[model samples]
Target: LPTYKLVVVGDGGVGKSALTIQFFQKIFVPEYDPTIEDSYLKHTEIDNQWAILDVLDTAGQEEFSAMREQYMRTGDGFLIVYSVTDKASFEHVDRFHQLILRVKDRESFPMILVANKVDLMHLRKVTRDQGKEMATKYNIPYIETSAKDPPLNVDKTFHDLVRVIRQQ
Candidate 1:
């Protein structure tokens, strides 16, 4: 089976951990200590293709700022997550985008912009169109997901990214 390294990144409290935990282990954790870095191995099939995904859930806090480049260098693809209810989190998306571009030294790479916490639709500050527009500007795929509720698209997002990585 093929193995791909996928990194999950975004500001703290954006539900990066929740999405990976829910996707791999099938559980939703609402509260936990902010992640420094956590890794999970998942074996699953997408579009009838079986593979192992090494998912690195990264800390969004700057306490680990010095290590960001190291993480950036290791991924095959990335899930750039942001909470729909937090504009501050959304604001850092571009910085993250640029960092990845520089670290990988590529004009284009496999990535997905994930607008998380759609379950909080009542309190959303980031619109789906905004996410789409950003993706269009970067020419990457965009997905809106709720790691809570039905935990919608948490798995699909990862699966979609693997396909993108394979094409790269």
Candidate 2:
């Protein structure tokens, strides 16, 4: 079976951990804890094909910068996430993108720009149009999801990246 390594990234408390857990465990975790480099593996099917999904939940803190590059290099595709409620997190998405490009040494790669925490619409600081515009700039898929919402498109963020990875 094919295996894909996906790295999840964003600013600290941007909901990367919550989204990753919700995707794999089908549950929501409201609590926020800083992650270092947590990895998870699962056997699953995407687009009617079966494969092993290896996900790396990366730390957003700069203290782990050295380790972050290592994780970033190994990923087959990436889920670069940001919280819609935090403008700083959203701004850092470009920096993360550049870091990935520099680390991978590729002008273009398979990745998805995710504006998470869509459920907190009232507290939203980043607009959907802004997210879409950034995705357009990077020529990547733009997806908005709420990890807190059990029925949202959180899984699609990863699945879509896998599909893009497979295509490329």
Candidate 3:
């Protein structure tokens, strides 16, 4: 079994926990607490390839700057999540990219930029194309999802990332 540790990161209250919970545990607690100092690790298979995704859902509001280098060391890949309804959060995508590079020292690693909360399309502040632009700039795959949508592409996003990782 090929295993990988994946981290979901972004500004606080950007739905990182909600997205992960909905995808892994299959339940969305609309009101979710940030993982903060704690971390939650989970496993799932993508296309029959078993993986151990150790998700360190860090606090969005942390002065994690002091520990940014350390955080980067803890994962194999990253799911840079941002709220599609919040333009400011979306802007942090680049900072997260830089953090990944600081730790991994390589830009070729597998990654996915999640423009989450697509269910709030009615209140959409960022377009899918803009998300695509960020992904293109970072050379990573992009997917916009809504945890509120039970049949959303949450699985497809992870599975597609697994496929891409396998190809690499």
lDDT of 1 by residue, 1-168 (tens): 799889898887889888988888888767755547778897889888899998888876656554455657978999999899999989999988898888899998899999999988799999989889999999999999887756899889999999999877
- Give the worst 10-residue stretch by lDDT in candidate 2: 60-69
The whole-model lDDT of each prediction reads 0.86, 0.86, 0.75
TM-score order of candidates, top first:
2, 1, 3
Q: lDDT of model 3 at residue 154?
A: 79
Q: In model 3, what lDDT does residue 86 have?
A: 89
Off-target runs (Cα >4 Å) in candidate 2 are 32-34, 64-69
- Write candidate 3's Cα lDDT for 14-63 as tens digits: 77777777777788776667545445556777667677665555666646
lDDT of 3: 0.75
TM-score of 2: 0.93
For residues 1-168, what per-residue lDDT tens digits would candidate 2 score against the true structure? 899999998888888888888888888757656546778899988989998999988875657476567668788998889999999999999898998898899999889999988888799999989999999999999999888866478878889999999998
Which residue pairs come into collision in candidate 3? 12-60
| Model 3 misplaced regions, further than 4 Å | 35-38, 61-71, 149-151
